[PDB]
Amino acid sequence: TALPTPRAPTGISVIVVGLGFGGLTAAIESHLRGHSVILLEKVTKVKQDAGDAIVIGPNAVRLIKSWGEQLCEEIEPHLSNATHAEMLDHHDRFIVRHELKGWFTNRGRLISILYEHARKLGIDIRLGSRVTKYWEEDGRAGVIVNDRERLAADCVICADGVHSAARAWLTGQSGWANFRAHMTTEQLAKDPEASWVLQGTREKDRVYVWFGDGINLAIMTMKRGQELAWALMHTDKFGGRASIDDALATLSPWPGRLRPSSVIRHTLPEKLVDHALIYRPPLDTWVSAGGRVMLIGDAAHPYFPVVGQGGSQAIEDGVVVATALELAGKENVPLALRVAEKIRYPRATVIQLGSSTLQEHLFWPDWEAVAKDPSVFANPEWILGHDCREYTHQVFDTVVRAVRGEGEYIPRNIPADGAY
Ligand SMILES: Cc1cc2nc3c(=O)[nH]c(=O)nc-3n(C[C@H](O)[C@H](O)[C@H](O)COP(=O)(O)OP(=O)(O)OC[C@H]3O[C@@H](n4cnc5c(N)ncnc54)[C@H](O)[C@@H]3O)c2cc1C
Ligand SMILES: [Hg+2]
């Protein structure tokens, strides 16, 4: 069915904050499971950036496809035809060639498709609604919208990103930045020191990633070589500000700076951003003291962008929350959030800690171990082949007994003796 009908009304009212991957998933899955949903987002429109490429893992694709058959046909023209990424070191020397189902596509174009699909389902989405001043009573929780309107519900699902005000409220208590840019390759094609990046681009999109000396640079061609995007993770970050001279100065110490610098120096000033990255250690809890406010997504577990699972885990967060609310019922909303936390926390934390350790291995690699084995340098099956919704149905009763103290719970959505 291109438009699935929701289950019978469960009587549970849910307030979702954020139009990201966590918020949209929480709203869509909750609506289809019978919950009464309102989604609050501060922006007036989904931001569209041609240089914001993202990878969605198969564990999240299968969840998205279950919301409607047509969604695959909508994303198909926006999927990259790139198949492999060429990995080089900071001397511009080849290391290994890595692959990359899965969706390698544009962020804003995928959010727009999911947002339009949510409106076709009849979900109450309210843009231009800035949320703050979270509050909680016995039996209800809520927010304040635009400092003029009070809203209340059975629970509040906070997916407001890394800069979460809800996390600051719930808790009460890094130096990394990321350049990102998009460009058209007309002027770059006239530079012989930079025209190399257009080689074989009409055939398919090419991906180049450089690692070393605390810097990561990725260059991705698009549209038969007519456009390219790039991203640069670094610790040289000094209102907002972005300058191409800072990106070039970051690459200056590299012995193999010539080929990458010759490309990115053609970036137009108005198409370059330099955002600070936010990482925090795993939280003690995602659920408020009263039990009716819960953090999901980046608000609960920000990752280092090297695992390609931040959006997928935010999607898994929203599906499990909506599933636990359906299985618990109206009179056990606090139990539902505690159950979803105990299911999700081990899986999201293993990946969170895995991104921090993998971050060290990629920005300051042990080149002697990489020389003897580069295939390790470049995601396992316990992540990609997982079905969060079926696992939640399988262990829900066991987790309820563990939350109420009746029994034990062994998490099996993570590998035994598992680091990442
Ligand atoms: C450089 C980089 C590369 C990445 N690459 C990938 C990748 O390839 N694959 C992948 O899966 N993940 C990737 N990620 C991670 C991914 O971006 C995030 O994990 C994911 O977007 C988290 O979603 P979210 O819903 O939690 O938050 P967000 O997507 O950040 O959404 C937060 C939303 O809440 C809104 N909001 C904030 N405050 C308020 C408020 N007070 N009231 C109302 N609304 C508010 C914001 O406008 C926003 O729409 C990457 C991250 C980075 C930094
Ligand atoms: Hg498809």
CSV table of C-alpha atoms and ligand atoms in Angstrom, one decimal:
chain,number,residue,atom,x,y,z
A,1,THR,CA,0.0,0.0,0.0
A,2,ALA,CA,1.4,3.4,-1.0
A,3,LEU,CA,-0.3,5.0,2.0
A,4,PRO,CA,-0.8,2.7,5.0
A,5,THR,CA,-3.7,3.4,7.3
A,6,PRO,CA,-2.9,3.9,11.0
A,7,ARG,CA,-3.9,1.5,13.7
A,8,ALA,CA,-7.0,2.2,15.9
A,9,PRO,CA,-6.5,5.3,18.1
A,10,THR,CA,-4.6,4.3,21.2
A,11,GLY,CA,-5.6,7.4,23.2
A,12,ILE,CA,-1.9,8.4,23.8
A,13,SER,CA,-1.1,12.0,22.9
A,14,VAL,CA,2.6,12.6,21.9
A,15,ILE,CA,4.5,15.8,21.5
A,16,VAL,CA,7.5,15.5,19.3
A,17,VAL,CA,10.2,18.2,19.0
A,18,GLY,CA,12.3,18.4,15.9
A,19,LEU,CA,12.0,17.8,12.2
A,20,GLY,CA,15.2,15.7,11.9
A,21,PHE,CA,15.5,12.0,11.5
A,22,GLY,CA,14.6,11.3,15.1
A,23,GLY,CA,11.6,13.6,15.2
A,24,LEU,CA,10.1,12.7,11.8
A,25,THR,CA,10.5,9.0,12.6
A,26,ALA,CA,8.9,9.3,16.0
A,27,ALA,CA,6.0,11.2,14.5
A,28,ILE,CA,5.4,8.9,11.5
A,29,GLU,CA,5.7,5.6,13.4
A,30,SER,CA,3.6,6.9,16.4
A,31,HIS,CA,0.9,8.1,14.0
A,32,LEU,CA,0.8,4.7,12.2
A,33,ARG,CA,0.6,2.9,15.6
A,34,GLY,CA,-2.5,4.9,16.6
A,35,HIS,CA,-1.0,7.7,18.7
A,36,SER,CA,-2.2,11.3,18.5
A,37,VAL,CA,0.9,13.2,17.4
A,38,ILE,CA,2.0,16.9,17.2
A,39,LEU,CA,5.5,17.7,15.8
A,40,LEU,CA,7.1,21.0,16.6
A,41,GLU,CA,9.9,22.4,14.6
A,42,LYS,CA,11.5,25.9,14.8
A,43,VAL,CA,12.5,26.3,11.1
A,44,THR,CA,9.9,27.5,8.6
A,45,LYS,CA,11.2,25.2,5.9
A,46,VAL,CA,13.4,22.1,5.4
A,47,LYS,CA,16.9,23.4,4.7
A,48,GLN,CA,18.2,22.4,1.3
A,49,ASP,CA,21.9,22.0,0.7
A,50,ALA,CA,23.3,20.2,-2.3
A,51,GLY,CA,26.6,19.5,-0.4
A,52,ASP,CA,25.0,17.7,2.6
A,53,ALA,CA,25.5,14.1,1.5
A,54,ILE,CA,24.6,11.4,4.0
A,55,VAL,CA,24.6,7.6,4.1
A,56,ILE,CA,21.5,5.7,5.5
A,57,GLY,CA,22.2,2.2,6.5
A,58,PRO,CA,20.0,-0.8,5.5
A,59,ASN,CA,18.8,-1.1,9.1
A,60,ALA,CA,17.0,2.2,8.7
A,61,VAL,CA,16.1,1.8,5.0
A,62,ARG,CA,13.9,-1.2,5.8
A,63,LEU,CA,12.1,0.9,8.4
A,64,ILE,CA,11.5,3.8,6.0
A,65,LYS,CA,10.2,1.5,3.2
A,66,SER,CA,7.6,0.1,5.6
A,67,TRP,CA,6.0,3.5,5.7
A,68,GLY,CA,5.0,3.4,2.1
A,69,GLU,CA,6.0,1.7,-1.2
A,70,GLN,CA,6.3,4.9,-3.2
A,71,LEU,CA,9.0,6.3,-0.9
A,72,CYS,CA,11.6,4.2,-2.8
A,73,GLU,CA,10.5,5.7,-6.1
A,74,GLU,CA,10.8,9.2,-4.6
A,75,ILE,CA,14.4,8.8,-3.4
A,76,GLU,CA,15.7,7.0,-6.5
A,77,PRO,CA,16.6,10.1,-8.6
A,78,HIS,CA,18.5,11.5,-5.6
A,79,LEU,CA,20.6,8.3,-5.0
A,80,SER,CA,24.3,8.5,-5.8
A,81,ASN,CA,25.6,6.1,-8.4
A,82,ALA,CA,29.0,6.0,-6.6
A,83,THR,CA,30.1,2.5,-5.6
A,84,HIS,CA,33.6,2.9,-4.0
A,85,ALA,CA,35.6,5.4,-2.0
A,86,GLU,CA,39.4,5.8,-2.7
A,87,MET,CA,41.2,6.2,0.6
A,88,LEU,CA,44.5,8.1,0.7
A,89,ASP,CA,46.9,9.3,3.4
A,90,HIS,CA,48.1,12.9,4.1
A,91,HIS,CA,50.9,12.2,1.7
A,92,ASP,CA,48.3,11.7,-1.1
A,93,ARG,CA,49.3,8.0,-1.3
A,94,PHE,CA,46.8,5.2,-2.0
A,95,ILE,CA,45.8,3.1,1.1
A,96,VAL,CA,42.7,1.0,0.2
A,97,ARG,CA,39.5,1.1,-1.9
A,98,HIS,CA,36.3,0.8,0.2
A,99,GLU,CA,32.8,0.0,-1.0
A,100,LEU,CA,30.2,2.7,-0.9
A,101,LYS,CA,21.8,-2.0,0.3
A,102,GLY,CA,21.9,1.5,1.6
A,103,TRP,CA,21.0,5.1,0.6
A,104,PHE,CA,23.9,7.5,-0.3
A,105,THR,CA,21.9,10.6,-1.0
A,106,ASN,CA,21.2,14.2,0.0
A,107,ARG,CA,20.0,15.1,3.5
A,108,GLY,CA,17.5,17.9,2.8
A,109,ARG,CA,16.0,16.0,-0.1
A,110,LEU,CA,15.4,12.9,2.0
A,111,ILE,CA,13.9,15.0,4.9
A,112,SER,CA,11.7,16.8,2.4
A,113,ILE,CA,10.4,13.5,1.1
A,114,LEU,CA,9.8,12.2,4.6
A,115,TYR,CA,8.1,15.5,5.5
A,116,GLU,CA,5.8,15.5,2.5
A,117,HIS,CA,4.9,11.9,3.2
A,118,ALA,CA,4.1,12.8,6.8
A,119,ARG,CA,1.7,15.5,5.5
A,120,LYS,CA,0.1,13.0,3.2
A,121,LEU,CA,-0.6,10.8,6.2
A,122,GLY,CA,-2.3,13.7,7.9
A,123,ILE,CA,0.3,14.2,10.7
A,124,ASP,CA,0.0,17.6,12.5
A,125,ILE,CA,3.3,19.2,11.8
A,126,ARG,CA,3.8,22.8,12.9
A,127,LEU,CA,6.8,24.7,11.6
A,128,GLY,CA,8.1,28.0,13.0
A,129,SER,CA,7.5,26.6,16.5
A,130,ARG,CA,10.5,27.2,18.8
A,131,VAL,CA,10.3,25.0,21.8
A,132,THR,CA,11.7,25.8,25.3
A,133,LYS,CA,10.7,25.7,29.0
A,134,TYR,CA,10.0,22.0,29.3
A,135,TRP,CA,7.7,21.1,32.2
A,136,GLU,CA,6.3,18.0,33.8
A,137,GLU,CA,3.5,17.1,36.2
A,138,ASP,CA,2.0,13.9,37.5
A,139,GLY,CA,0.2,12.4,34.5
A,140,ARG,CA,1.3,14.9,31.8
A,141,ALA,CA,4.3,16.8,30.3
A,142,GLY,CA,4.6,19.6,27.9
A,143,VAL,CA,6.5,22.6,26.4
A,144,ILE,CA,6.2,26.3,25.7
A,145,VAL,CA,6.0,27.3,22.0
A,146,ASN,CA,7.4,30.7,20.9
A,147,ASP,CA,7.2,31.9,24.5
A,148,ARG,CA,3.4,32.4,24.1
A,149,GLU,CA,1.7,29.0,24.0
A,150,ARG,CA,1.6,26.1,26.5
A,151,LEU,CA,1.1,22.6,25.2
A,152,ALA,CA,0.6,19.4,27.2
A,153,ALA,CA,0.5,15.7,26.4
A,154,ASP,CA,1.0,12.2,27.8
A,155,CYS,CA,4.7,12.4,26.9
A,156,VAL,CA,7.2,14.6,25.1
A,157,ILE,CA,9.8,13.1,22.7
A,158,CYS,CA,12.7,15.4,22.3
A,159,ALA,CA,14.7,15.0,19.1
A,160,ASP,CA,16.1,18.6,19.0
A,161,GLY,CA,19.7,17.7,18.0
A,162,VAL,CA,23.1,18.0,19.5
A,163,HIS,CA,22.4,21.5,20.8
A,164,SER,CA,19.5,20.2,22.8
A,165,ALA,CA,17.9,22.5,25.3
A,166,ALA,CA,15.8,19.5,26.5
A,167,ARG,CA,19.0,17.7,27.5
A,168,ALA,CA,20.1,20.8,29.5
A,169,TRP,CA,16.7,20.8,31.2
A,170,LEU,CA,16.7,17.0,31.8
A,171,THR,CA,20.3,17.0,33.1
A,172,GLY,CA,20.4,20.4,34.7
A,173,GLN,CA,24.1,20.5,34.1
A,174,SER,CA,35.3,19.4,22.2
A,175,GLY,CA,37.4,21.4,19.8
A,176,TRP,CA,36.3,19.6,16.6
A,177,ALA,CA,34.8,21.5,13.6
A,178,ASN,CA,33.7,20.5,10.1
A,179,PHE,CA,34.0,22.4,6.9
A,180,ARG,CA,31.4,21.6,4.3
A,181,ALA,CA,30.9,23.0,0.8
A,182,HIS,CA,29.3,22.5,-2.6
A,183,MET,CA,30.5,23.8,-5.9
A,184,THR,CA,30.0,23.7,-9.7
A,185,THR,CA,33.0,22.5,-11.6
A,186,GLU,CA,33.0,25.0,-14.5
A,187,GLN,CA,36.0,27.1,-13.2
A,188,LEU,CA,37.7,24.1,-11.7
A,189,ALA,CA,37.7,22.4,-15.1
A,190,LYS,CA,39.9,25.3,-16.4
A,191,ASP,CA,42.6,24.7,-13.8
A,192,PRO,CA,45.1,21.9,-14.8
A,193,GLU,CA,46.2,21.4,-11.2
A,194,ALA,CA,42.6,20.7,-10.2
A,195,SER,CA,41.0,19.2,-13.3
A,196,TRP,CA,42.2,15.7,-12.2
A,197,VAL,CA,39.1,15.4,-9.9
A,198,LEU,CA,36.8,15.4,-13.0
A,199,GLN,CA,38.4,12.2,-14.4
A,200,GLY,CA,35.8,9.5,-15.1
A,201,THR,CA,33.0,11.5,-13.5
A,202,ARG,CA,30.5,11.3,-16.4
A,203,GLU,CA,30.6,7.5,-16.0
A,204,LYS,CA,29.8,7.5,-12.3
A,205,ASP,CA,30.3,9.6,-9.1
A,206,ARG,CA,33.8,9.3,-7.5
A,207,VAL,CA,34.7,9.6,-3.8
A,208,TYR,CA,38.1,10.6,-2.5
A,209,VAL,CA,38.9,10.5,1.3
A,210,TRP,CA,42.2,11.7,2.8
A,211,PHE,CA,43.3,10.7,6.3
A,212,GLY,CA,46.2,11.8,8.5
A,213,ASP,CA,47.7,14.2,11.0
A,214,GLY,CA,44.4,14.9,12.7
A,215,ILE,CA,42.5,15.9,9.6
A,216,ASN,CA,39.9,14.1,7.5
A,217,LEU,CA,38.9,15.4,4.0
A,218,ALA,CA,36.3,13.8,1.7
A,219,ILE,CA,35.6,14.9,-1.9
A,220,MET,CA,32.5,13.6,-3.7
A,221,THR,CA,31.6,14.3,-7.4
A,222,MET,CA,28.0,14.6,-8.5
A,223,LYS,CA,25.8,15.1,-11.5
A,224,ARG,CA,28.1,13.5,-14.1
A,225,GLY,CA,31.0,15.7,-12.8
A,226,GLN,CA,29.0,19.0,-13.1
A,227,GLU,CA,29.1,19.5,-9.3
A,228,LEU,CA,31.1,18.3,-6.3
A,229,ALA,CA,30.9,18.5,-2.5
A,230,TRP,CA,33.5,18.2,0.2
A,231,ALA,CA,33.9,18.0,3.9
A,232,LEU,CA,36.8,18.6,6.2
A,233,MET,CA,37.0,17.5,9.9
A,234,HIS,CA,39.7,19.3,11.9
A,235,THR,CA,40.6,20.8,15.3
A,236,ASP,CA,41.9,24.1,13.9
A,237,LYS,CA,38.6,25.9,14.8
A,238,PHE,CA,39.6,29.3,16.2
A,239,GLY,CA,28.4,34.4,15.7
A,240,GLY,CA,29.4,32.1,12.9
A,241,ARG,CA,32.4,32.4,10.5
A,242,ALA,CA,33.8,30.4,7.6
A,243,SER,CA,36.7,31.2,5.3
A,244,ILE,CA,38.3,29.1,2.6
A,245,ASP,CA,41.7,30.4,3.7
A,246,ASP,CA,41.3,28.5,7.0
A,247,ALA,CA,40.5,25.3,5.1
A,248,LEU,CA,43.6,25.8,2.9
A,249,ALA,CA,45.7,26.6,6.0
A,250,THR,CA,44.5,23.4,7.6
A,251,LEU,CA,45.8,21.4,4.7
A,252,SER,CA,49.1,23.3,4.4
A,253,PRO,CA,51.2,21.0,6.7
A,254,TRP,CA,50.2,18.0,4.6
A,255,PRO,CA,53.0,16.7,2.3
A,256,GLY,CA,50.3,15.7,-0.3
A,257,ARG,CA,48.3,18.9,-0.1
A,258,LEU,CA,48.6,19.8,-3.8
A,259,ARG,CA,45.8,17.8,-5.3
A,260,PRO,CA,43.2,18.4,-2.5
A,261,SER,CA,44.0,22.1,-2.1
A,262,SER,CA,43.9,22.7,-5.8
A,263,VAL,CA,40.2,21.5,-5.8
A,264,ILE,CA,38.8,23.2,-2.7
A,265,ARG,CA,40.3,26.6,-3.4
A,266,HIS,CA,37.7,27.1,-6.1
A,267,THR,CA,34.9,27.1,-3.5
A,268,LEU,CA,32.7,30.2,-3.6
A,269,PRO,CA,32.5,32.0,-0.2
A,270,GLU,CA,28.7,31.9,0.0
A,271,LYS,CA,28.7,28.0,-0.3
A,272,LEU,CA,31.0,27.2,2.5
A,273,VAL,CA,30.2,26.5,6.2
A,274,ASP,CA,32.4,25.7,9.2
A,275,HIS,CA,30.3,24.3,12.0
A,276,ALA,CA,31.6,23.2,15.4
A,277,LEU,CA,31.1,19.5,16.3
A,278,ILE,CA,29.6,18.6,19.6
A,279,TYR,CA,30.4,15.3,21.4
A,280,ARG,CA,29.4,14.3,24.9
A,281,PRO,CA,29.9,11.1,26.8
A,282,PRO,CA,27.0,8.7,27.3
A,283,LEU,CA,24.3,10.0,29.6
A,284,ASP,CA,23.1,8.3,32.7
A,285,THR,CA,19.5,8.4,31.6
A,286,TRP,CA,17.4,9.6,28.7
A,287,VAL,CA,14.2,9.8,30.7
A,288,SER,CA,13.2,12.7,33.0
A,289,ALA,CA,12.5,12.1,36.7
A,290,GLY,CA,8.8,12.0,36.3
A,291,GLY,CA,9.1,9.6,33.4
A,292,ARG,CA,7.2,11.5,30.7
A,293,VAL,CA,10.0,13.3,28.9
A,294,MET,CA,12.7,11.4,26.9
A,295,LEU,CA,15.6,12.4,24.7
A,296,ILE,CA,16.3,10.5,21.4
A,297,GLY,CA,18.7,11.0,18.5
A,298,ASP,CA,21.6,13.4,18.7
A,299,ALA,CA,20.1,14.9,21.8
A,300,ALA,CA,20.7,11.7,23.7
A,301,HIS,CA,23.8,10.2,22.0
A,302,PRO,CA,25.9,12.4,19.6
A,303,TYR,CA,28.3,10.4,17.4
A,304,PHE,CA,31.7,11.2,15.9
A,305,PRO,CA,30.8,11.3,12.1
A,306,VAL,CA,32.9,8.2,11.1
A,307,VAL,CA,30.3,5.4,11.7
A,308,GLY,CA,27.6,6.5,9.3
A,309,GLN,CA,24.9,5.5,11.8
A,310,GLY,CA,23.8,8.7,13.5
A,311,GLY,CA,20.7,9.2,11.5
A,312,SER,CA,19.9,5.4,11.4
A,313,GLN,CA,20.1,5.2,15.2
A,314,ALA,CA,17.9,8.3,15.5
A,315,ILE,CA,15.4,6.4,13.3
A,316,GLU,CA,15.7,3.3,15.5
A,317,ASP,CA,15.1,5.5,18.5
A,318,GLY,CA,11.9,6.8,17.2
A,319,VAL,CA,10.5,3.4,16.0
A,320,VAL,CA,11.2,1.7,19.4
A,321,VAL,CA,9.6,4.6,21.3
A,322,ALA,CA,6.5,4.5,19.2
A,323,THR,CA,6.4,0.7,19.5
A,324,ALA,CA,6.9,0.6,23.3
A,325,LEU,CA,4.1,3.2,23.7
A,326,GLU,CA,1.7,1.0,21.7
A,327,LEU,CA,2.5,-2.2,23.7
A,328,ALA,CA,2.4,-0.5,27.1
A,329,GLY,CA,-0.9,1.4,26.7
A,330,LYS,CA,-2.4,4.7,28.0
A,331,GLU,CA,-2.0,3.9,31.7
A,332,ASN,CA,1.7,2.9,31.4
A,333,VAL,CA,3.3,5.8,29.4
A,334,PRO,CA,6.2,6.1,32.0
A,335,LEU,CA,6.8,2.4,31.8
A,336,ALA,CA,6.9,2.6,27.9
A,337,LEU,CA,9.6,5.2,27.9
A,338,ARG,CA,11.7,3.3,30.5
A,339,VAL,CA,11.3,0.2,28.4
A,340,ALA,CA,12.4,1.9,25.2
A,341,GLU,CA,15.4,3.4,27.0
A,342,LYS,CA,16.6,0.0,28.3
A,343,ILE,CA,16.2,-1.5,24.7
A,344,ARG,CA,17.9,1.4,22.9
A,345,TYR,CA,20.6,2.6,25.3
A,346,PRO,CA,23.0,-0.4,25.0
A,347,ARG,CA,22.8,-0.3,21.2
A,348,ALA,CA,23.2,3.4,20.8
A,349,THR,CA,26.0,3.6,23.4
A,350,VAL,CA,28.1,0.8,21.9
A,351,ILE,CA,28.0,2.7,18.5
A,352,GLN,CA,28.6,6.0,20.4
A,353,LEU,CA,31.8,4.7,22.1
A,354,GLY,CA,32.8,2.9,18.9
A,355,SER,CA,32.8,6.2,17.0
A,356,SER,CA,35.1,7.8,19.6
A,357,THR,CA,37.6,5.0,19.4
A,358,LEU,CA,37.4,4.8,15.6
A,359,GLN,CA,37.9,8.5,15.5
A,360,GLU,CA,41.4,8.2,17.0
A,361,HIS,CA,42.4,5.4,14.5
A,362,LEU,CA,41.4,7.5,11.5
A,363,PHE,CA,42.8,10.9,12.4
A,364,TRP,CA,46.1,9.7,13.8
A,365,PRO,CA,46.5,6.2,12.3
A,366,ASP,CA,49.1,3.6,13.2
A,367,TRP,CA,50.6,3.6,9.7
A,368,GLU,CA,52.7,0.5,10.5
A,369,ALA,CA,49.6,-1.6,11.3
A,370,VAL,CA,47.8,-0.1,8.3
A,371,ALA,CA,50.7,-1.1,6.1
A,372,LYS,CA,50.4,-4.7,7.2
A,373,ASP,CA,46.6,-4.7,7.0
A,374,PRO,CA,44.7,-1.9,5.3
A,375,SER,CA,41.3,-3.7,4.9
A,376,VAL,CA,40.6,-2.9,8.5
A,377,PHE,CA,41.3,0.8,8.0
A,378,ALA,CA,38.2,1.5,5.8
A,379,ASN,CA,30.0,-1.9,9.4
A,380,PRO,CA,29.3,-5.3,10.8
A,381,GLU,CA,26.1,-7.4,10.4
A,382,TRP,CA,24.8,-7.0,13.9
A,383,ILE,CA,24.1,-3.3,13.0
A,384,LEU,CA,23.0,-3.5,9.4
A,385,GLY,CA,21.0,-6.7,9.5
A,386,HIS,CA,19.1,-5.7,12.7
A,387,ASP,CA,15.3,-5.1,12.8
A,388,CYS,CA,14.6,-2.9,15.8
A,389,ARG,CA,10.8,-3.2,15.6
A,390,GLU,CA,10.8,-7.0,15.6
A,391,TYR,CA,13.4,-7.1,18.4
A,392,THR,CA,11.2,-4.8,20.5
A,393,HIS,CA,8.2,-7.1,20.1
A,394,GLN,CA,10.4,-10.0,21.0
A,395,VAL,CA,11.8,-8.7,24.3
A,396,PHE,CA,9.1,-6.2,25.4
A,397,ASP,CA,7.7,-8.4,28.1
A,398,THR,CA,11.2,-9.4,29.3
A,399,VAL,CA,12.2,-5.7,29.5
A,400,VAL,CA,9.0,-4.8,31.4
A,401,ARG,CA,9.8,-7.4,34.0
A,402,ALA,CA,13.4,-6.1,34.2
A,403,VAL,CA,12.3,-2.5,34.6
A,404,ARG,CA,9.8,-3.4,37.4
A,405,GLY,CA,12.6,-5.4,39.0
A,406,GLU,CA,10.9,-8.8,38.4
A,407,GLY,CA,13.7,-10.4,36.3
A,408,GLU,CA,16.9,-9.9,34.3
A,409,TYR,CA,17.5,-8.6,30.8
A,410,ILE,CA,20.4,-9.6,28.6
A,411,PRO,CA,20.7,-7.1,25.6
A,412,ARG,CA,21.0,-9.1,22.4
A,413,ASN,CA,20.7,-6.2,20.0
A,414,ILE,CA,24.5,-5.7,20.6
A,415,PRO,CA,27.3,-8.2,20.1
A,416,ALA,CA,28.4,-10.3,23.1
A,417,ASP,CA,31.7,-8.9,24.4
A,418,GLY,CA,31.1,-6.1,22.0
A,419,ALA,CA,33.0,-2.9,21.6
A,420,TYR,CA,31.7,-1.9,18.2
B,1,LIG,C1,29.6,15.9,9.4
B,1,LIG,C2,28.5,14.9,9.7
B,1,LIG,C3,28.3,13.9,8.8
B,1,LIG,C4,27.3,13.0,9.1
B,1,LIG,N1,27.0,12.0,8.2
B,1,LIG,C5,26.1,11.1,8.5
B,1,LIG,C6,25.8,10.0,7.6
B,1,LIG,O1,26.4,9.9,6.6
B,1,LIG,N2,24.9,9.2,7.9
B,1,LIG,C7,24.2,9.3,9.0
B,1,LIG,O2,23.3,8.5,9.2
B,1,LIG,N3,24.4,10.2,9.9
B,1,LIG,C8,25.3,11.1,9.7
B,1,LIG,N4,25.5,12.1,10.6
B,1,LIG,C9,24.7,12.2,11.8
B,1,LIG,C10,23.3,12.8,11.6
B,1,LIG,O3,23.5,14.0,11.0
B,1,LIG,C11,22.6,12.9,12.9
B,1,LIG,O4,22.9,11.9,13.7
B,1,LIG,C12,21.1,13.0,12.8
B,1,LIG,O5,20.8,14.0,11.9
B,1,LIG,C13,20.5,13.1,14.1
B,1,LIG,O6,19.1,13.5,14.0
B,1,LIG,P1,18.3,14.2,15.1
B,1,LIG,O7,17.0,14.0,14.7
B,1,LIG,O8,18.6,13.6,16.2
B,1,LIG,O9,18.7,15.7,15.0
B,1,LIG,P2,18.7,16.7,13.9
B,1,LIG,O10,18.7,16.2,12.6
B,1,LIG,O11,19.8,17.6,14.1
B,1,LIG,O12,17.4,17.5,14.2
B,1,LIG,C14,17.1,18.5,15.1
B,1,LIG,C15,15.9,19.3,14.7
B,1,LIG,O13,15.3,19.9,15.8
B,1,LIG,C16,15.1,21.3,15.6
B,1,LIG,N5,15.2,22.0,16.8
B,1,LIG,C17,16.2,22.3,17.5
B,1,LIG,N6,15.9,23.0,18.6
B,1,LIG,C18,14.6,23.2,18.5
B,1,LIG,C19,13.6,23.8,19.4
B,1,LIG,N7,13.9,24.4,20.5
B,1,LIG,N8,12.4,23.8,19.0
B,1,LIG,C20,12.1,23.2,17.9
B,1,LIG,N9,12.9,22.6,17.1
B,1,LIG,C21,14.2,22.5,17.4
B,1,LIG,C22,16.1,21.6,14.5
B,1,LIG,O14,15.7,22.6,13.7
B,1,LIG,C23,16.2,20.3,13.7
B,1,LIG,O15,15.3,20.2,12.6
B,1,LIG,C24,26.5,13.1,10.3
B,1,LIG,C25,26.7,14.1,11.2
B,1,LIG,C26,27.7,15.0,10.9
B,1,LIG,C27,28.0,16.1,11.9
B,2,HG,HG,13.8,2.4,-4.9
